[PDB]
Structure formats: structure tokens, C-alpha cells
Design a protein around this nucleic acid. Structure first.
Length: 95
DNA sequence: TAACTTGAAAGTATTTCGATTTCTTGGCTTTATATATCTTGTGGAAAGCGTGCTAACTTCGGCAGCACATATACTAA
């Protein structure tokens, strides 16, 4: 179980299944998507997840003890949104 | 310092789909007339608990019972 014996290189020249979908997506990207952008919500999620990576408290007494319950709670307050798009109305919190 | 080609982002529109409505069927109701018959739909006349308070005076006012006393007939000496 090492990395020196593990496959950067173009993922091709092997009998695969998902690689066909991957190449189709690459072609669809080269068609209209330009460089690496238009991923607004994607970068939002990325940064909002990185904001909580390895941040230490200002005081030593504010260290979260091991095993503390973290609960994810979505909230739907507003009516002003897409009732059509599967429903994505409002923010989600952690407590 | 704009101009056009980008992207997922709305309404917005139309197309079909669940469902309830609307449209068809019978058939019974009712109108008279009389024709006729089974058991079972009746008409009608009998007859074999439970209390409370006194509303209070007056002056009965009788009898209930009771009941006390005793005069008398029976019995022991």
C-alpha cells in the first residue's frame, strides 16, 4: 500500500467506462467554456469549506473538546426564489 | 474606454396528463277502470312511591288504656 506503485498523464490508452463521459465533458467544455471560470457557486462552496480548515481559537479555553456534536441545519425563510429549480431557497448552518 | 460573445439563470409558455364534470342510457313514479284472490297488514273490545312540615294558636274532648280500688264470692281454719 504505497504511492510509488500508483499511476499529469493523460487518462487514456486503457479500457474504461467513465473515461468516455470524461472525454465528452472535456469536449463540451472546449466547445463553450473558456478557461477555468463561471464556477461562482463552486468557488463559494470551496471558500466556505476552507474557512473552517485548521483554524485555532484566540483563547486556549475556547478549544472544542473531542466528540462534540455538529449538526447541519438548512433553513427556508424566503419566498423570493425558484420554486421551479428543485428548491434552493436559503442558507444552511452548522451548530 | 466601450462592444460582442460568453453562462446559468427566469417565466413563460405550451403540451400533455390526472380528474372531475358533462353527457348518454334505463325505469319508475304517476293518471285513470275494472278484471280477481292469499295470508297477513290492521280495527276494535275486552279484562286479567313516597316526601316534608307541622304555621300556630283554642280548647276540645274521646276514648285508649290502664289501671287503682274495692266490694264481693270463694276458701282455709
Amino acid at each position: 500500500c504505497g504511492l510509488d506503485k500508483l499511476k499529469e498523464v493523460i487518462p487514456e490508452n486503457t479500457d474504461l467506462v467513465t473515461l468516455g463521459v470524461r472525454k465528452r465533458f472535456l469536449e463540451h467544455r472546449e466547445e463553450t467554456i473558456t478557461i477555468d471560470r463561471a464556477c461562482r457557486q463552486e468557488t463559494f462552496v470551496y471558500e466556505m469549506e476552507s474557512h473552517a480548515i485548521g483554524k485555532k481559537p484566540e483563547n486556549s479555553a475556547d478549544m472544542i473538546e473531542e466528540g462534540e456534536l455538529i449538526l447541519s441545519v438548512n433553513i427556508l425563510y424566503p419566498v423570493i426564489f425558484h420554486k421551479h429549480k428543485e428548491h434552493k431557497p436559503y442558507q444552511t448552518m452548522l451548530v
